[PDB]
Protein backbone atom coordinates (compact mmCIF):
# COMPACT_ATOMS: atom_id res chain seq x y z
CA UNK A 240 0.00 0.00 0.00
CA UNK A 241 2.62 2.66 1.06
CA UNK A 242 5.77 2.27 -1.18
CA UNK A 243 6.21 1.80 -4.94
CA UNK A 244 8.93 -0.28 -6.67
CA UNK A 245 7.89 -0.61 -10.32
CA UNK A 246 6.15 2.11 -12.23
CA UNK A 247 6.07 1.14 -15.86
CA UNK A 248 4.44 3.76 -17.94
CA UNK A 249 5.86 2.90 -21.40
CA UNK A 250 6.53 6.49 -22.38
CA UNK A 251 10.07 5.87 -23.88
CA UNK A 252 11.25 2.21 -23.60
CA UNK A 253 9.54 -1.19 -23.21
CA UNK A 254 10.30 -1.15 -19.48
CA UNK A 255 11.64 -4.80 -19.66
CA UNK A 256 8.56 -6.42 -21.11
CA UNK A 257 8.93 -9.18 -23.60
CA UNK A 258 6.86 -11.48 -25.73
CA UNK A 259 5.81 -14.60 -23.77
CA UNK A 260 5.56 -17.25 -26.49
CA UNK A 261 8.10 -17.43 -29.40
CA UNK A 262 5.80 -15.81 -31.96
CA UNK A 263 3.88 -13.38 -29.80
CA UNK A 264 4.86 -9.82 -30.96
CA UNK A 265 5.20 -6.64 -28.75
CA UNK A 266 4.93 -3.06 -29.90
CA UNK A 267 4.54 0.21 -28.07
CA UNK A 268 2.04 2.64 -29.51
CA UNK A 269 1.45 6.33 -29.08
CA UNK A 270 -2.02 7.25 -27.75
CA UNK A 271 -3.31 3.70 -27.30
CA UNK A 272 -2.19 3.89 -23.68
CA UNK A 273 -4.32 4.32 -20.64
CA UNK A 274 -5.41 7.99 -20.70
CA UNK A 275 -4.26 8.41 -24.35
CA UNK A 276 -0.54 8.18 -23.34
CA UNK A 277 1.87 5.52 -24.79
CA UNK A 278 0.86 1.82 -24.58
CA UNK A 279 2.09 -1.73 -24.96
CA UNK A 280 0.26 -3.71 -27.53
CA UNK A 281 0.53 -7.55 -27.51
CA UNK A 282 -0.35 -9.03 -30.94
CA UNK A 283 -0.02 -12.36 -32.96
CA UNK A 284 -0.81 -14.85 -30.06
CA UNK A 285 -1.49 -18.62 -30.46
CA UNK A 286 -2.72 -19.93 -27.12
CA UNK A 287 -4.06 -18.74 -23.80
CA UNK A 288 -0.46 -19.27 -22.48
CA UNK A 289 1.06 -16.92 -25.17
CA UNK A 290 1.17 -13.34 -23.72
CA UNK A 291 3.77 -10.95 -22.27
CA UNK A 292 6.17 -11.03 -19.30
CA UNK A 293 8.70 -9.04 -17.33
CA UNK A 294 11.36 -10.39 -14.94
CA UNK A 295 11.51 -8.00 -12.02
CA UNK A 296 14.13 -9.72 -9.88
CA UNK A 297 15.68 -6.35 -9.16
CA UNK A 298 12.72 -5.04 -7.15
CA UNK A 299 10.79 -8.05 -5.88
CA UNK A 300 12.19 -10.05 -2.90
CA UNK A 301 11.03 -13.50 -1.70
CA UNK A 302 8.71 -13.46 1.34
CA UNK A 303 7.52 -9.82 0.91
CA UNK A 304 3.93 -8.88 -0.09
CA UNK A 305 3.28 -6.76 -3.18
CA UNK A 306 0.34 -4.79 -4.61
CA UNK A 307 0.27 -5.87 -8.25
CA UNK A 308 -1.60 -3.61 -10.63
CA UNK A 309 -2.03 -3.30 -14.40
CA UNK A 310 -4.37 -1.37 -16.64
CA UNK A 311 -5.47 -3.48 -19.55
CA UNK A 312 -7.80 -3.06 -22.54
CA UNK A 313 -9.09 -5.01 -25.48
CA UNK A 314 -10.84 -4.79 -28.75
CA UNK A 315 -12.82 -7.94 -29.35
CA UNK A 316 -16.52 -8.75 -29.09
CA UNK A 317 -17.94 -9.38 -25.67
CA UNK A 318 -16.04 -9.92 -22.44
CA UNK A 319 -12.54 -11.41 -21.87
CA UNK A 320 -10.83 -13.32 -19.12
CA UNK A 321 -7.60 -11.53 -18.14
CA UNK A 322 -5.01 -13.24 -15.87
CA UNK A 323 -2.13 -11.93 -13.86
CA UNK A 324 0.44 -14.72 -13.09
CA UNK A 325 3.57 -14.37 -10.92
CA UNK A 326 6.19 -17.16 -11.44
CA UNK A 327 9.66 -17.88 -9.96
CA UNK A 328 12.54 -20.31 -9.57
CA UNK A 329 13.43 -21.35 -5.98
CA UNK A 330 17.04 -21.60 -4.78
CA UNK A 331 16.10 -25.06 -3.30
CA UNK A 332 12.97 -26.28 -5.09
CA UNK A 333 14.78 -25.36 -8.42
CA UNK A 334 11.71 -25.64 -10.70
CA UNK A 335 9.55 -22.87 -12.23
CA UNK A 336 6.85 -22.70 -9.57
CA UNK A 337 3.90 -20.74 -11.16
CA UNK A 338 0.59 -19.25 -9.79
CA UNK A 339 -2.43 -17.42 -11.28
CA UNK A 340 -3.08 -14.51 -8.80
CA UNK A 341 -5.91 -12.42 -10.15
CA UNK A 342 -8.71 -13.05 -12.61
CA UNK A 343 -10.91 -10.22 -14.01
CA UNK A 344 -13.56 -10.39 -16.75
CA UNK A 345 -13.02 -7.33 -18.87
CA UNK A 346 -15.20 -5.85 -21.59
CA UNK A 347 -14.32 -4.60 -25.06
CA UNK A 348 -13.38 -0.93 -25.54
CA UNK A 349 -12.41 -0.15 -21.92
CA UNK A 350 -9.35 0.69 -19.78
CA UNK A 351 -10.22 -1.63 -16.90
CA UNK A 352 -7.69 -2.19 -14.08
CA UNK A 353 -6.61 -5.53 -12.47
CA UNK A 354 -4.89 -6.24 -9.18
CA UNK A 355 -4.09 -8.51 -6.12
CA UNK A 356 -1.82 -8.75 -3.05
CA UNK A 357 0.86 -11.53 -3.21
CA UNK A 358 3.79 -12.80 -1.12
CA UNK A 359 6.46 -15.10 -2.60
CA UNK A 360 8.00 -17.94 -0.47
CA UNK A 361 10.76 -16.62 1.94
CA UNK A 362 13.37 -18.07 -0.37
CA UNK A 363 12.17 -17.39 -3.87
CA UNK A 364 13.78 -15.34 -6.56
CA UNK A 365 14.01 -14.38 -10.17
CA UNK A 366 10.40 -13.40 -9.95
CA UNK A 367 8.42 -12.45 -13.00
CA UNK A 368 5.05 -10.99 -13.82
CA UNK A 369 2.99 -11.98 -16.86
CA UNK A 370 -0.31 -11.06 -18.47
CA UNK A 371 -2.68 -13.40 -20.31
CA UNK A 372 -6.23 -13.82 -21.53
CA UNK A 373 -8.23 -17.02 -21.67
CA UNK A 374 -8.35 -16.45 -25.38
CA UNK A 375 -5.85 -15.71 -28.12
CA UNK A 376 -6.97 -12.05 -28.46
CA UNK A 377 -4.73 -8.94 -29.11
CA UNK A 378 -4.56 -6.73 -26.05
CA UNK A 379 -2.98 -3.63 -24.51
CA UNK A 380 -1.63 -2.70 -21.13
CA UNK A 381 -0.09 0.28 -19.51
CA UNK A 382 0.62 1.58 -16.06
CA UNK A 383 2.12 -1.53 -14.51
CA UNK A 384 2.39 -0.63 -10.86
CA UNK A 385 3.80 -2.78 -8.05
CA UNK A 386 3.89 -1.59 -4.50
CA UNK A 387 4.70 -2.87 -1.02
CA UNK A 388 3.50 -1.92 2.48
CA UNK A 389 6.01 0.31 4.39
CA UNK A 390 27.43 19.24 -7.08
CA UNK A 391 28.43 16.88 -4.14
CA UNK A 392 30.99 14.60 -6.00
CA UNK A 393 31.31 11.37 -3.94
CA UNK A 394 33.75 8.66 -2.67
CA UNK A 395 32.84 6.46 -5.67
CA UNK A 396 34.66 5.22 -8.71
CA UNK A 397 32.40 6.84 -11.30
CA UNK A 398 32.60 10.24 -9.63
CA UNK A 399 36.39 9.72 -9.01
CA UNK A 400 37.00 8.83 -12.66
CA UNK A 401 34.45 11.17 -14.20
CA UNK A 402 37.09 13.33 -15.82
CA UNK A 403 38.87 10.30 -17.28
CA UNK A 404 36.69 7.45 -18.44
CA UNK A 405 33.64 5.43 -17.60
CA UNK A 406 34.15 2.80 -14.93
CA UNK A 407 32.17 -0.33 -15.62
CA UNK A 408 31.21 -3.76 -14.58
CA UNK A 409 29.08 -6.68 -15.60
CA UNK A 410 25.54 -7.90 -14.89
CA UNK A 411 23.99 -11.22 -15.79
CA UNK A 412 20.67 -12.97 -15.37
CA UNK A 413 21.68 -14.36 -11.95
CA UNK A 414 23.14 -11.14 -10.52
CA UNK A 415 20.26 -9.03 -11.90
CA UNK A 416 18.23 -10.57 -8.89
CA UNK A 417 20.57 -9.42 -6.09
CA UNK A 418 19.53 -6.47 -3.85
CA UNK A 419 23.02 -5.51 -2.66
CA UNK A 420 24.54 -5.92 -6.12
CA UNK A 421 21.97 -3.46 -7.49
CA UNK A 422 22.94 -1.10 -4.67
CA UNK A 423 26.63 -1.56 -5.62
CA UNK A 424 26.36 -0.83 -9.33
CA UNK A 425 24.17 2.16 -8.72
CA UNK A 426 26.61 3.47 -6.16
CA UNK A 427 29.93 2.84 -8.15
CA UNK A 428 29.67 2.00 -11.90
CA UNK A 429 28.64 4.04 -14.88
CA UNK A 430 29.05 1.31 -17.46
CA UNK A 431 27.69 -2.22 -17.78
CA UNK A 432 28.38 -5.17 -20.09
CA UNK A 433 26.07 -8.15 -20.33
CA UNK A 434 28.13 -11.26 -19.37
CA UNK A 435 26.26 -13.58 -21.74
CA UNK A 436 22.91 -12.02 -22.52
CA UNK A 437 23.79 -10.22 -25.74
CA UNK A 438 25.99 -12.91 -27.18
CA UNK A 439 24.77 -14.51 -30.44
CA UNK A 440 23.44 -17.69 -28.84
CA UNK A 441 21.37 -15.62 -26.35
CA UNK A 442 19.94 -13.39 -29.02
CA UNK A 443 19.43 -15.41 -32.22
CA UNK A 444 16.04 -17.04 -32.80
CA UNK A 445 16.03 -20.31 -34.80
CA UNK A 446 12.31 -20.49 -35.55
CA UNK A 447 11.40 -18.86 -38.83
CA UNK A 448 14.75 -17.06 -39.27
CA UNK A 449 15.81 -16.68 -42.95
CA UNK A 450 18.89 -15.74 -44.98
CA UNK A 451 17.69 -12.04 -45.18
CA UNK A 452 15.69 -11.72 -42.06
CA UNK A 453 17.53 -13.13 -39.07
CA UNK A 454 15.18 -13.21 -36.15
CA UNK A 455 16.70 -11.69 -32.96
CA UNK A 456 15.57 -11.04 -29.44
CA UNK A 457 16.51 -8.99 -26.42
CA UNK A 458 14.49 -11.05 -23.95
CA UNK A 459 17.55 -12.43 -22.12
CA UNK A 460 19.11 -8.96 -21.90
CA UNK A 461 15.95 -7.00 -21.10
CA UNK A 462 16.01 -6.64 -17.31
CA UNK A 463 19.59 -5.49 -17.66
CA UNK A 464 19.08 -2.97 -20.46
CA UNK A 465 15.98 -1.72 -18.68
CA UNK A 466 17.76 -1.15 -15.38
CA UNK A 467 20.61 0.69 -17.05
CA UNK A 468 18.35 2.89 -19.19
CA UNK A 469 16.09 3.81 -16.23
CA UNK A 470 19.23 4.72 -14.19
CA UNK A 471 21.35 6.28 -16.85
CA UNK A 472 24.18 3.78 -16.89
CA UNK A 473 25.74 3.27 -20.38
CA UNK A 474 26.18 -0.12 -21.98
CA UNK A 475 28.75 -1.96 -24.04
CA UNK A 476 27.14 -4.35 -26.48
CA UNK A 477 28.90 -7.69 -26.40
CA UNK A 478 29.22 -9.19 -28.90
CA UNK A 479 28.27 -9.42 -32.60
CA UNK A 480 30.83 -11.91 -33.86
CA UNK A 481 32.71 -14.69 -32.03
CA UNK A 482 33.76 -18.19 -32.89
CA UNK A 483 32.24 -19.19 -29.56
CA UNK A 484 28.80 -18.98 -27.86
CA UNK A 485 27.14 -18.85 -31.31
CA UNK A 486 24.91 -21.68 -32.36
CA UNK A 487 26.03 -23.92 -35.24
CA UNK A 488 22.73 -23.71 -37.01
CA UNK A 489 23.43 -20.06 -37.75
CA UNK A 490 26.04 -21.40 -40.17
CA UNK A 491 24.00 -24.09 -41.87
CA UNK A 492 21.90 -23.96 -45.12
CA UNK A 493 18.80 -25.35 -43.42
CA UNK A 494 19.05 -23.66 -39.95
CA UNK A 495 19.79 -27.02 -38.44
CA UNK A 496 22.79 -27.60 -36.19
CA UNK A 497 23.56 -30.47 -38.55
CA UNK A 498 23.12 -28.90 -41.95
CA UNK A 499 25.69 -28.01 -44.58
CA UNK A 500 28.09 -25.07 -44.48
CA UNK A 501 26.57 -22.14 -46.37
CA UNK A 502 28.18 -20.06 -49.19
CA UNK A 503 30.04 -16.85 -48.38
CA UNK A 504 27.36 -15.00 -50.37
CA UNK A 505 24.83 -16.52 -47.96
CA UNK A 506 26.70 -15.58 -44.78
CA UNK A 507 26.97 -12.01 -46.00
CA UNK A 508 23.18 -12.00 -45.96
CA UNK A 509 22.89 -13.67 -42.56
CA UNK A 510 25.66 -11.49 -41.07
CA UNK A 511 24.28 -8.17 -42.32
CA UNK A 512 20.79 -9.11 -41.17
CA UNK A 513 21.87 -10.17 -37.65
CA UNK A 514 23.62 -6.88 -37.21
CA UNK A 515 20.93 -4.68 -38.72
CA UNK A 516 18.21 -6.31 -36.73
CA UNK A 517 20.23 -6.35 -33.61
CA UNK A 518 20.66 -2.56 -33.78
CA UNK A 519 17.03 -2.11 -34.83
CA UNK A 520 15.74 -3.91 -31.78
CA UNK A 521 17.76 -1.86 -29.35
CA UNK A 522 16.73 1.42 -30.96
CA UNK A 523 13.15 0.16 -31.03
CA UNK A 524 12.93 -1.20 -27.51
CA UNK A 525 15.34 0.98 -25.44
CA UNK A 526 15.98 4.19 -27.37
CA UNK A 527 16.86 6.14 -24.28
CA UNK A 528 19.62 3.62 -23.54
CA UNK A 529 23.05 4.96 -23.93
CA UNK A 530 24.66 2.43 -26.21
CA UNK A 531 28.23 3.87 -26.10
CA UNK A 532 30.31 0.92 -27.45
CA UNK A 533 30.04 -2.46 -29.05
CA UNK A 534 32.41 -5.37 -29.50
CA UNK A 535 31.94 -5.86 -33.21
CA UNK A 536 34.40 -8.77 -33.58
CA UNK A 537 35.56 -10.79 -30.48
CA UNK A 538 38.84 -12.74 -30.05
CA UNK A 539 39.32 -13.65 -33.74
CA UNK A 540 43.17 -13.92 -33.69
CA UNK A 541 44.89 -17.22 -32.81
CA UNK A 542 46.93 -17.82 -29.70
CA UNK A 543 49.06 -20.10 -31.92
CA UNK A 544 52.17 -18.15 -33.16
CA UNK A 545 52.19 -20.43 -36.23
CA UNK A 546 48.81 -19.01 -37.24
CA UNK A 547 49.73 -15.39 -36.53
CA UNK A 548 52.80 -15.78 -38.69
CA UNK A 549 51.48 -17.65 -41.75
CA UNK A 550 47.68 -17.42 -41.55
CA UNK A 551 47.13 -13.76 -40.66
CA UNK A 552 45.77 -14.80 -37.26
CA UNK A 553 42.97 -16.98 -38.50
CA UNK A 554 41.89 -19.54 -35.92
CA UNK A 555 41.51 -23.12 -37.15
CA UNK A 556 38.41 -23.69 -39.36
CA UNK A 557 35.65 -25.69 -37.59
CA UNK A 558 33.21 -25.55 -34.70
CA UNK A 559 33.90 -25.68 -30.86
CA UNK A 560 37.26 -26.16 -28.98
CA UNK A 561 38.44 -22.71 -30.10
CA UNK A 562 37.94 -23.45 -33.77
CA UNK A 563 36.17 -20.73 -35.83
CA UNK A 564 32.99 -21.44 -37.83
CA UNK A 565 33.64 -18.05 -39.33
CA UNK A 566 37.08 -19.16 -40.59
CA UNK A 567 35.34 -22.38 -41.61
CA UNK A 568 33.14 -20.46 -44.04
CA UNK A 569 35.40 -17.63 -45.16
CA UNK A 570 38.80 -19.39 -45.08
CA UNK A 571 40.47 -16.58 -43.13
CA UNK A 572 39.83 -13.25 -41.34
CA UNK A 573 38.27 -11.38 -44.31
CA UNK A 574 35.07 -11.53 -42.34
CA UNK A 575 36.30 -9.00 -39.74
CA UNK A 576 36.24 -6.07 -42.16
CA UNK A 577 32.85 -7.22 -43.49
CA UNK A 578 31.30 -7.23 -40.02
CA UNK A 579 32.70 -3.79 -39.17
CA UNK A 580 31.18 -2.44 -42.36
CA UNK A 581 27.71 -3.62 -41.54
CA UNK A 582 28.24 -2.39 -37.99
CA UNK A 583 29.31 1.02 -39.20
CA UNK A 584 26.24 1.19 -41.53
CA UNK A 585 23.67 0.47 -38.74
CA UNK A 586 25.13 1.56 -35.41
CA UNK A 587 24.10 4.78 -33.67
CA UNK A 588 26.76 7.47 -34.22
CA UNK A 589 27.24 7.79 -30.45
CA UNK A 590 28.07 3.97 -30.31
CA UNK A 591 31.78 3.34 -31.00
CA UNK A 592 33.02 0.16 -32.57
CA UNK A 593 35.64 -2.07 -30.99
CA UNK A 594 37.83 -5.02 -31.77
CA UNK A 595 37.99 -7.02 -28.54
CA UNK A 596 40.74 -9.47 -27.59
CA UNK A 597 42.60 -11.23 -24.80
CA UNK A 598 46.37 -12.11 -24.35
CA UNK A 599 46.54 -8.72 -26.06
CA UNK A 600 50.03 -8.01 -24.60
CA UNK A 601 51.70 -11.23 -25.74
CA UNK A 602 54.07 -10.03 -28.50
CA UNK A 603 53.23 -12.19 -31.54
CA UNK A 604 49.50 -11.76 -30.87
CA UNK A 605 49.60 -8.08 -29.84
CA UNK A 606 51.33 -7.33 -33.12
CA UNK A 607 48.73 -9.16 -35.07
CA UNK A 608 45.73 -7.58 -33.33
CA UNK A 609 47.26 -4.07 -33.64
CA UNK A 610 48.02 -4.47 -37.34
CA UNK A 611 44.44 -5.55 -38.13
CA UNK A 612 42.98 -2.80 -35.98
CA UNK A 613 45.07 0.00 -37.45
CA UNK A 614 44.13 -1.07 -40.90
CA UNK A 615 40.43 -0.88 -39.86
CA UNK A 616 40.85 2.47 -38.13
CA UNK A 617 42.37 3.99 -41.19
CA UNK A 618 39.43 2.76 -43.22
CA UNK A 619 36.89 4.70 -41.04
CA UNK A 620 35.60 1.33 -39.81
CA UNK A 621 37.04 0.92 -36.23
CA UNK A 622 37.01 3.34 -33.30
CA UNK A 623 38.88 1.58 -30.50
CA UNK A 624 40.87 -1.47 -29.33
CA UNK A 625 39.30 -3.52 -26.54
CA UNK A 626 41.88 -4.92 -24.18
CA UNK A 627 40.13 -7.75 -22.32
CA UNK A 628 42.93 -7.78 -19.73
CA UNK A 629 42.49 -11.17 -18.18
CA UNK A 630 45.74 -10.78 -16.30
CA UNK A 631 47.24 -11.90 -12.95
CA UNK A 632 48.50 -10.09 -9.77
CA UNK A 633 52.09 -10.37 -11.01
CA UNK A 634 53.88 -7.08 -11.50
CA UNK A 635 56.30 -9.05 -13.73
CA UNK A 636 56.12 -11.72 -16.44
CA UNK A 637 53.64 -12.50 -19.19
CA UNK A 638 50.82 -10.02 -18.35
CA UNK A 639 53.16 -7.82 -16.33
CA UNK A 640 53.08 -4.08 -16.09
CA UNK A 641 55.77 -3.67 -18.65
CA UNK A 642 54.23 -5.95 -21.28
CA UNK A 643 50.88 -4.43 -20.42
CA UNK A 644 51.99 -0.74 -20.82
CA UNK A 645 53.71 -1.84 -24.00
CA UNK A 646 50.48 -2.97 -25.62
CA UNK A 647 48.42 -0.11 -24.27
CA UNK A 648 50.89 2.33 -25.74
CA UNK A 649 51.24 0.50 -29.03
CA UNK A 650 47.46 0.47 -29.41
CA UNK A 651 46.89 4.13 -28.63
CA UNK A 652 49.74 4.87 -31.11
CA UNK A 653 47.26 3.84 -33.78
CA UNK A 654 45.05 6.88 -33.54
CA UNK A 655 42.00 4.98 -32.19
CA UNK A 656 40.94 4.77 -28.64
CA UNK A 657 41.41 1.85 -26.26
CA UNK A 658 39.06 0.49 -23.61
CA UNK A 659 39.94 -1.96 -20.94
CA UNK A 660 36.97 -4.18 -21.51
CA UNK A 661 36.99 -7.25 -19.21
CA UNK A 662 39.56 -6.61 -16.51
CA UNK A 663 40.21 -9.18 -13.83
CA UNK A 664 43.28 -9.82 -11.72
CA UNK A 665 43.75 -13.46 -10.72
CA UNK A 666 45.41 -14.32 -7.41
CA UNK A 667 46.16 -17.64 -9.08
CA UNK A 668 44.59 -19.62 -6.22
CA UNK A 669 46.22 -17.62 -3.45
CA UNK A 670 49.64 -17.62 -5.05
CA UNK A 671 49.49 -13.78 -4.90
CA UNK A 672 48.09 -11.71 -2.06
CA UNK A 673 45.19 -9.30 -2.00
CA UNK A 674 48.00 -6.73 -1.74
CA UNK A 675 50.03 -7.75 -4.66
CA UNK A 676 46.60 -7.77 -6.28
CA UNK A 677 45.89 -4.17 -5.06
CA UNK A 678 49.22 -3.15 -6.43
CA UNK A 679 48.40 -4.49 -9.86
CA UNK A 680 44.98 -2.91 -10.05
CA UNK A 681 46.54 0.41 -8.91
CA UNK A 682 49.13 -0.02 -11.63
CA UNK A 683 46.53 -0.52 -14.38
CA UNK A 684 44.29 2.38 -13.61
CA UNK A 685 47.46 4.43 -13.24
CA UNK A 686 48.64 3.39 -16.72
CA UNK A 687 45.26 4.43 -18.21
CA UNK A 688 45.25 7.74 -16.47
CA UNK A 689 48.81 8.42 -17.80
CA UNK A 690 47.76 7.85 -21.40
CA UNK A 691 44.82 10.21 -20.95
CA UNK A 692 47.08 12.93 -19.44
CA UNK A 693 49.51 12.56 -22.38
CA UNK A 694 48.51 12.57 -26.15
CA UNK A 695 45.73 12.68 -27.28
CA UNK A 696 44.79 11.67 -30.21
CA UNK A 697 43.81 8.18 -28.83
CA UNK A 698 42.32 7.91 -25.30
CA UNK A 699 41.31 5.27 -22.82
CA UNK A 700 37.55 5.98 -22.64
CA UNK A 701 36.55 3.14 -20.29
CA UNK A 702 37.90 0.72 -17.81
CA UNK A 703 35.55 -2.10 -16.76
CA UNK A 704 35.95 -5.12 -14.54
CA UNK A 705 34.48 -8.48 -15.53
CA UNK A 706 32.16 -8.91 -12.59
CA UNK A 707 30.92 -7.08 -9.58
CA UNK A 708 32.38 -9.13 -6.71
CA UNK A 709 34.50 -12.20 -5.89
CA UNK A 710 31.35 -14.27 -5.53
CA UNK A 711 30.45 -13.85 -9.19
CA UNK A 712 33.43 -14.34 -11.49
CA UNK A 713 33.99 -16.72 -14.34
CA UNK A 714 37.40 -17.42 -12.92
CA UNK A 715 36.10 -18.94 -9.75
CA UNK A 716 36.26 -17.52 -6.21
CA UNK A 717 39.51 -19.22 -5.50
CA UNK A 718 41.12 -16.51 -7.64
CA UNK A 719 39.42 -13.49 -6.00
CA UNK A 720 39.94 -11.37 -9.05
CA UNK A 721 37.67 -8.40 -8.44
CA UNK A 722 37.34 -5.20 -6.37
CA UNK A 723 34.72 -6.50 -3.96
CA UNK A 724 34.54 -9.53 -1.70
CA UNK A 725 31.74 -12.04 -1.63
CA UNK A 726 29.99 -9.67 0.85
CA UNK A 727 30.47 -6.58 -1.30
CA UNK A 728 32.86 -4.95 1.15
CA UNK A 729 35.78 -3.29 -0.67
CA UNK A 730 39.02 -5.24 -0.98
CA UNK A 731 42.46 -3.62 -0.76
CA UNK A 732 42.39 -3.25 -4.51
CA UNK A 733 39.37 -1.06 -4.16
CA UNK A 734 41.21 1.65 -2.30
CA UNK A 735 44.46 1.18 -4.07
CA UNK A 736 42.29 2.31 -7.02
CA UNK A 737 40.16 4.68 -4.92
CA UNK A 738 43.10 6.98 -4.42
CA UNK A 739 44.78 7.63 -7.73
CA UNK A 740 42.52 10.72 -8.19
CA UNK A 741 42.63 13.71 -5.71
CA UNK A 742 39.18 14.98 -4.41
CA UNK A 743 39.73 18.27 -6.27
CA UNK A 744 39.30 16.19 -9.46
CA UNK A 745 36.23 14.09 -8.97
CA UNK A 746 33.08 14.82 -10.94
CA UNK A 747 29.66 13.76 -12.12
CA UNK A 748 29.90 10.06 -12.75
CA UNK A 749 26.44 10.34 -14.18
CA UNK A 750 27.77 12.79 -16.74
CA UNK A 751 31.28 11.81 -17.56
CA UNK A 752 33.37 13.54 -20.13
Ligand SMILES: O[C@@H]1[C@@H](O)[C@H](O)OC[C@H]1O
Pocket residue numbers: 434537538595597627661713
Ligand atom coordinates in the same frame (compact mmCIF):
# COMPACT_ATOMS: atom_id res chain seq x y z
O1 LIG B 1 32.71 -13.03 -23.55
C1 LIG B 1 33.93 -12.92 -22.86
C2 LIG B 1 35.04 -13.00 -23.88
O2 LIG B 1 35.19 -11.75 -24.56
C3 LIG B 1 36.38 -13.34 -23.22
O3 LIG B 1 37.24 -13.59 -24.33
O4 LIG B 1 36.30 -14.50 -22.41
C4 LIG B 1 35.35 -14.34 -21.36
C5 LIG B 1 33.99 -14.17 -22.03
O5 LIG B 1 32.93 -14.07 -21.08
Ligand SMILES: [Ca+2]
Pocket residue numbers: 248249250251252254
Ligand atom coordinates in the same frame (compact mmCIF):
# COMPACT_ATOMS: atom_id res chain seq x y z
CA1 LIG C 1 9.55 4.67 -19.77
Ligand SMILES: [Ca+2]
Pocket residue numbers: 248249250272273276277278381382
Ligand atom coordinates in the same frame (compact mmCIF):
# COMPACT_ATOMS: atom_id res chain seq x y z
CA1 LIG D 1 1.48 5.17 -20.87
Ligand SMILES: [Ca+2]
Pocket residue numbers: 486487496
Ligand atom coordinates in the same frame (compact mmCIF):
# COMPACT_ATOMS: atom_id res chain seq x y z
CA1 LIG E 1 21.87 -25.30 -30.32
